[PDB]
């Protein structure tokens, strides 16, 4: 019956994100997406009464690393789009890890658990690109990057957030399964074409 299995099976939407991130030499992002996929897949499988026999760790661990992995995937995809060089890249990666870890651990269902990562990462991106536009005296990411990556990526991002945090009360089983697909598609689009620091 589809009602049970859809949130479990549709978590495999993140597997194309892992393979595409690996293929573009975004290995650290592919770890976070694969970690997320594993903990999101098992969070839904362990929650589902018809296949809860599959899970081995406590529900508390799977639920925490489902939410933490999801929020960290949103951070590392936006910091990949930002495309910082060293020593800022490792510093901004660690800033997300440490602040999202404490925030999610303090309260995993409270406000700021996803709008913290997105709100902060888009402010960091805006400040970098506004400096780069004043420097270049022209639209910094090419109209290609806006119309192919940033526009579609943030549209699938906005779709994922409004599916999960508005429409999900209509039917969880279908709307949460479309959230996995919309968010995985957002992570594919926001991630650049090549990891220029490693390829």
């Amino acid at each position: 019956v589809a009602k049970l299995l859809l949130p479990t099976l549709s978590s495999l939407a993140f597997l194309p994100t892992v393979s595409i991130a690996t293929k573009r030499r975004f290995y650290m992002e592919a770890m976070v997406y694969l970690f997320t996929m594993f903990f999101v897949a098992f969070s839904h499988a362990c929650d589902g009464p018809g296949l809860s026999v599959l899970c081995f760790m406590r529900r508390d661990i799977l639920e925490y690393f489902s939410i933490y992995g999801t929020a960290l995937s949103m951070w590392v995809s936006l910091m990949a789009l930002a495309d910082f060089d060293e020593p800022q890249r490792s510093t901004f990666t660690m800033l997300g890890v440490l602040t999202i870890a404490v925030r999610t651990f303090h309260d995993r269902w409270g406000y700021g658990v996803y709008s913290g990562p997105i709100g902060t990462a888009t402010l960091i991106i805006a400040v970098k690109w506004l400096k780069k536009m004043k420097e270049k005296k022209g639209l910094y990411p090419d109209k290609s990057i806006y119309t192919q990556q940033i526009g579609p990526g943030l549209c699938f991002g906005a779709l994922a957030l409004m599916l999960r945090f508005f429409f999900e009360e209509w039917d969880y089983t279908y709307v949460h399964s479309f959230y996995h697909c919309a968010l995985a598609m957002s992570f594919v689009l926001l991630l650049p074409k090549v990891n220029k620091k490693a390829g």
Partner: antibody
Amino acid sequence: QVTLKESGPGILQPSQTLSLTCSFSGFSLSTSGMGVSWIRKPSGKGLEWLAHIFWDDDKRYNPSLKSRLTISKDTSSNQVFLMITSIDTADTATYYCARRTWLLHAMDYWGQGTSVTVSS
Amino acid sequence: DIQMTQSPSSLSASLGGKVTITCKASQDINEYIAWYQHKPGKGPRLLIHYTSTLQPGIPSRFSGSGSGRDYSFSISNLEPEDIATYYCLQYDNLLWTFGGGTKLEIK
């Protein structure tokens, strides 16, 4: 429609100074993100960039020539001026006036260029 | 300055054929390389911008590729109207530099 048209003296000698002018239409260069630039093709040689002037009256010059170029603007008549000082017979070229934009940062419209000669 | 060096200085070709020009930058120029077509007694035309983007109205036989110091430009289905001098432009910095130019010729 967009157009640029370069004009100048044609004949000079190395004691003298060069007063290049560039009339344009389709844009007025008071518009935000709009720019005009000067590029020159020396006699029997490839292109080299000289100078920029932007919408906000900001300016740039070639480090190799920075001392003896001054770029100016007049949007009252849609014109830009480049003044080149302390001339040498190395300045024998065609001088092009090219329009840059905000969305694509390279120049899109050029004029047909104007030739300058520097000999007795 | 950043040095832009086009590999063919001159390039002779058949009509209806295909050709490729390559250009090497002395630095990583972050895919900001425009390609221009110059004809005797005419102002140059912008054909391609960023690295691969054709200017609107330009025929789809012109194409360019590459990233990080190594960029390429190509004319397919080469017509006699494509016999011209082709320059690249590094435009990552507002210190603009052109490539040495490739004079295309009918063989």
